């Protein structure tokens, strides 16, 4: 009876997808970059004024040497988040490939573009991040895992787009 939505996390290594998912799952934040092999499936539960939304996040590996059968995971997905570190402009430059591979396997799904770790130093990609989403109708959010700047916004937007009720809000 409880609705469930499959979420695939994509983005290069070092963009803090695992820290973001772990923060949502437990509230702890782990400081040491450990590589991810394959994918980890984590059930996230968000309470709302209109019942429960329960995403099943697929934390896909961001390293090509570890991305074994990575495209095999996007099948029958219902939403996706493209993560990139604003500290590494190459990751933003590689974001279009992530969007291409996402829309190939599951087209027209709601996809959120998330610039992780705005807190580190100063933005190295500045406002260029607006250029990609403005055409493909993604929504860009500055988020972080060291500080909870916007950590709930991507899931809130995905819940609004999937449940069809823009007035839904997390509590």
């Amino acid at each position: 009876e409880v609705p469930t939505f499959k979420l695939v996390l994509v983005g290069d290594g070092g963009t803090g997808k695992t820290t973001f998912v772990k923060r949502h799952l437990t509230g702890e934040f782990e400081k040491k970059y450990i590589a991810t092999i394959g994918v980890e499936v984590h059930p996230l539960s968000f309470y709302t004024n209109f019942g429960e939304i329960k995403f099943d996040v697929w934390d896909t590996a961001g390293l090509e040497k570890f991305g074994g059968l990575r495209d095999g995971y996007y099948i029958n997905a219902q939403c996706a988040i493209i993560m990139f570190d604003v500290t590494s402009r190459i990751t933003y430059k590689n974001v279009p490939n992530w969007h291409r591979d996402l829309v190939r396997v599951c087209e027209n799904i709601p996809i959120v573009l998330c610039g992780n770790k705005v807190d580190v130093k100063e933005r190295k990609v500045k406002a260029k991040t607006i250029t990609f989403h403005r055409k493909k109708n993604l929504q860009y959010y500055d988020i972080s895992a060291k500080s909870n700047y916007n950590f709930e916004k991507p899931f809130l937007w995905l819940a609004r787009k999937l449940a069809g009720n823009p007035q839904l809000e997390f509590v």
Binding site: G38, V39, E40, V41, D56, G68, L69, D71, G72, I75, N76, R104, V105, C106, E107, V118, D119, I130, H133, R134, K135, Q139, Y140, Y141, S144, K146, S147, N148, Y149
Partner: protein, 916 residues
């Protein structure tokens, strides 16, 4: 062995089944790839199989091709088993799937991806059948599946060497032209052909500054043919029964034209064609605006209009006829009108309005493209079109359905850098300002029209500041009205519009000189009241705009003998509250830093006492409330520390900091340095504490020496990270510069702590910081430092030899002149001691005397220079240090230097002799 079982298990969410399924798949395919590839192709071709399984089969075949196809891949795995008999089969399977119109889009996409992966190595020379089948299907059957396949092929794998020297370019261009020229081809086929044209243009544009006539002629001919064909297509017409497809057709046509115009040399795109396509694009705006009167339809209308306006922006350098200009305005008014969904969103949530108007919104409507269009216009066209938009505004004062869009176009025109001048604008601008005043004065006006009036008036005044003789009274009246209409209404959107208008007034007018001190004070009070009312519901980067407006307000803070204390207290209350709410927003943080700096530029030791009691108790409460969590990382804690450090750093130059601030800050700063562990928290707290020590009065700090020393010992003890320990330098510098007499009994503890942390730490930057600290210690008192280092032992071994080894190794690693100078002066001071107990230690990096290696390294530095610690800044170049060192040496302090020079290479001795 059952491929279906593997492809079912691999999709399972549970870790165990997925990993074992993938391991079995890889082991099977490494054992015999020919069977696995054939099975995957079969289950991809079996229409009876579930779509998820077919798509997983194709996406797994894509990966297996990357590993076992053939050498030349950067990840090709040895001992493949894919004989040509399997490749020929699966190529046929893929080129059957990728163009079977009955197949679902996902399977076609997977097949095209696999074909692209194969073509990354096998194309074109190994697989001409691919190109033969694509060209056959496109030219004879107009199969848009094959056109999409070719378009994706050009995206990933085709390169300019294949495009120009190979047959790809000419053949593709001929096929595309043949498809476009024939009227029989369906509109969707034309769209696919134009997408192929766009890909070919991108191929021609990626390389530039060509140097081969074989390419230039081909490019020029293809450009001429493509422009002729696009003109013919734009001259073609449709029955308007498939308007969404016509909108996509026009959208891709103008995308091609904007690409040609913006990314190719002007030579190939004649100005006559510019003038023709200008008229064509204007007629297409008219057509799209008529079509719009008929939700996905509106979206495609806006998408097509964006590209048409982009083309007009590129052409904009051309002259626009008055009737063409009027058509452009009449179309942009219909196109720039706010959708009912956006009107509802702005009415219900002013935060989206603030995000959009501040330019931080994650969107790009037709309105932004119109802004770009009017911004790019040249001065004559801008001056003509301003009259048109002003006349349309004047005639449409009662037409509230469109007036908002007219005000937006007027704003966009006034954003243009060029100064609008013309024959009779003076009459026009008077009518315009009277209309805006009537809009402000009127009642029952829709809130969005009023909000557009409020933001347009500052642009009107700014653009025509050189033409209005009554600019001061008009600015005063309009500002007063904008503030009154925000105070006297409950629509927070209007309040946000008013504060944005206020920051636009601040960016052009010196309000503090035109309004007068009393009017300026009253406007500051009104704006802070508005900000206070708005802050109760701020979100989504509304706080950043509030902070910017507050910065502009405090930038007009009156002189100290006249400033109102209550206004300043409210200003600080706002800059604190708005930044404490949503503290993680980096923009809010930096703007609050700038606001505090602006609020503390006008301080003195008299009023600084009043500033202490206002500011400090707010920070002390947060420091106390963070004590329970052991001062762990938190955005609010870092924020209050970054405010404390700014308040300290903005010291009154008249003299030392008052004892009051020291008595306030010492206890919580000591506690956070003694208990915290987060790197950022320790760094900020050390930055504050060191400055407090450096600028505290000597007689006030003397009783607290033991506490300071204990804090330093903890801050460099092992239970804190080395990166946080990096900041130890400034604290020791402040201690020595402050306690210049009391440090004598306890200096041994400092040396012990520095040397122990130096020998423990691995981190390079931490090693450098401890080396700087030890350098400062040695330069202050070389005798005590050497006595302690030689006498004290760690792990039953004297510290001296280990620290010499690490010091010389790090100096050999150290870079940057600033750090080199400190080591230069330290080693020279050690040399000038002339005590045998140092120089008799043997060191190697051949074993040589310690002083000998010191002078050898100094020589090596002099050879290098021949061509940020700042703890010993003297602002003197390394060259004069070197020459004074060698001249003191040549003054024969110790005779060993001559023996070493004769031992050293003749070239080095010659370099020394030529340097001095």
């Amino acid at each position: 062995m059952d491929i279906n079982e593997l492809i079912i298990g691999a999709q399972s969410a549970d870790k165990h089944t997925r990993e074992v399924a993938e391991t079995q798949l890889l082991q099977w395919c490494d054992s015999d790839a020919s069977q696995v590839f054939k099975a995957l192709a079969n289950v991809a071709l079996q229409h009876e199989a579930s779509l998820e399984s077919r798509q997983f089969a194709l996406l797994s075949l894509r990966k297996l091709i990357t590993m076992y196809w053939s050498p030349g891949f950067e990840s090709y795995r040895s001992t493949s088993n894919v004989e040509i008999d399997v490749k020929d089969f699966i190529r046929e399977v893929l080129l059957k799937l990728c163009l079977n119109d009955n197949e679902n889009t996902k399977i076609k996409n997977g097949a095209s991806y696999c074909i692209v992966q194969i073509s990354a190595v096998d194309f074109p020379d190994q697989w001409p059948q691919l190109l033969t089948v694509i060209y056959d299907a496109i030219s004879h059957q107009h199969s848009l599946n094959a056109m999409s396949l070719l378009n994706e092929i050009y995206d990933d794998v085709v390169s300019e060497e294949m495009f120009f020297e190979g047959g790809i370019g000419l053949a593709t261009m001929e096929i595309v032209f043949k498809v476009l020229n024939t009227e029989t081809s369906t509109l969707i086929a034309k769209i696919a052909a134009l997408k192929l044209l766009k890909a070919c243009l991108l191929q021609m544009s990626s390389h530039n500054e060509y140097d081969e006539a074989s390419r230039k002629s081909f490019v020029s001919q293809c450009l001429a043919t493509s422009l002729q064909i696009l003109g013919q297509l734009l001259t073609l017409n449709f029955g308007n029964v498939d308007v969404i497809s016509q909108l996509k057709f026009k959208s891709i046509i103008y995308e091609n034209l904007v690409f040609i115009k913006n990314d190719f040399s002007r030579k190939h795109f004649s100005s006559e064609l510019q003038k023709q396509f200008k008229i064509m694009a204007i007629q297409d705006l008219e057509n799209v605006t008529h079509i719009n009167a008929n939700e996905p339809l509106l979206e495609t209308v806006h998408d097509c209009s964006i590209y048409i306006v982009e083309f007009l922006t590129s052409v904009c350098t051309l002259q626009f006829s008055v009737e063409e200009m009027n058509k452009i305005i009449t179309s942009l008014t219909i196109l720039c009108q706010l959708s009912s969904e956006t009107r509802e969103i702005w009415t219900s949530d002013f935060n989206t309005f603030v995000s959009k108007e501040t330019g931080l919104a994650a969107s790009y409507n037709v309105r932004d493209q119109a802004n770009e269009f009017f911004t790019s216009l040249p001065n004559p066209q801008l001056s003509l079109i301003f009259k048109v938009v002003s006349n349309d505004i004047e005639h449409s004062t009662c037409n509230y359905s469109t007036l908002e869009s007219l005000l937006y176009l007027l704003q966009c025109i006034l954003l243009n850098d060029d100064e609008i001048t013309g024959e009779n604008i003076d009459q026009s601008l008077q009518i315009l300002i009277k209309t805006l005043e009537n809009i402000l004065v009127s009642q029952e006006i829709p809130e969005l029209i009023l909000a557009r009036a409020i933001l347009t008036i500052p642009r009107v005044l700014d653009k025509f500041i050189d033409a209005l003789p009554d600019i001061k009274p008009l600015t005063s009246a309009f500002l007063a009205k904008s503030l009154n209409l925000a105070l006297k209404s409950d629509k927070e959107l209007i309040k946000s519009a008013t504060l944005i208008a206020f920051t636009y007034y601040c960016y052009f007018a010196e309000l503090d000189s035109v309004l007068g001190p009393e009017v300026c004070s009253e406007t500051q009070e009104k704006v802070i009241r508005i900000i206070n009312q708005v802050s109760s519901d701020a979100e989504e980067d509304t706080n950043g705009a509030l902070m910017e407006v507050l910065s502009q307000v405090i930038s007009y803070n009156p002189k100290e003998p006249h400033s109102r204390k209550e206004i300043l207290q409210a200003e600080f209350h706002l800059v604190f509250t708005i930044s404490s709410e949503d503290p993680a927003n980096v923009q809010v943080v930096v703007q609050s830093q700038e606001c505090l700096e602006k609020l503390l530029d006008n301080i003195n030791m008299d009023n600084y006492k009043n500033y202490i009691e206002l500011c400090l108790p707010s920070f002390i409460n947060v420091l106390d409330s963070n004590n329970a969590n052991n001062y762990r990382y938190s955005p609010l804690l870092s924020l209050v520390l970054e405010f404390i450090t700014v308040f300290l750093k903005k010291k009154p130059n008249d003299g030392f900091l008052p004892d009051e601030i020291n008595q306030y800050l010492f206890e919580p700063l000591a506690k956070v340095l003694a208990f915290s562990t987060e790197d950022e928290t320790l760094q900020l707290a050390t930055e504050a504490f060191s400055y407090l020590i450096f600028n505290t009065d000597t007689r006030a700090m003397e009783p607290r020496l033991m506490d300071i020393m204990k804090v330093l010992e903890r801050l460099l003890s092992l239970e804190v990270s080395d990166s946080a320990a990096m900041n130890v330098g400034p604290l020791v510098v402040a201690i020595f510069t402050r306690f210049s007499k009391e440090i004598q009994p306890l200096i041994g503890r400092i040396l012990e702590a520095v040397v122990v942390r130096l020998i423990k730490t691995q981190n390079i930057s931490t090693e450098q910081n401890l080396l700087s600290v030890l350098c400062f210690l040695t330069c202050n008192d070389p005798k005590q430092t050497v006595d302690f280092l030689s006498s004290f032992q760690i792990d039953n071994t004297d510290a001296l030899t280990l620290v010499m080894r690490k010091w010389i190794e790090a100096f050999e690693v150290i870079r940057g002149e600033k750090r080199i100078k400190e080591n230069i002066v330290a080693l020279s001071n050690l040399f000038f001691l002339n005590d045998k107990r140092l120089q008799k230690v043997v060191v190697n990096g051949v074993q040589v005397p310690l002083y000998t290696k010191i002078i050898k390294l100094f020589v090596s530095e002099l050879s290098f220079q021949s061509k940020i610690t700042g703890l010993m800044d003297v602002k003197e170049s390394v060259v004069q240090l070197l020459v004074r060192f060698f001249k003191e040496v040549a003054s024969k302090d110790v005779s060993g230097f001559h023996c070493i020079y004769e031992t050293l290479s003749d070239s080095e001795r010659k370099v020394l002799s030529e340097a001095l």
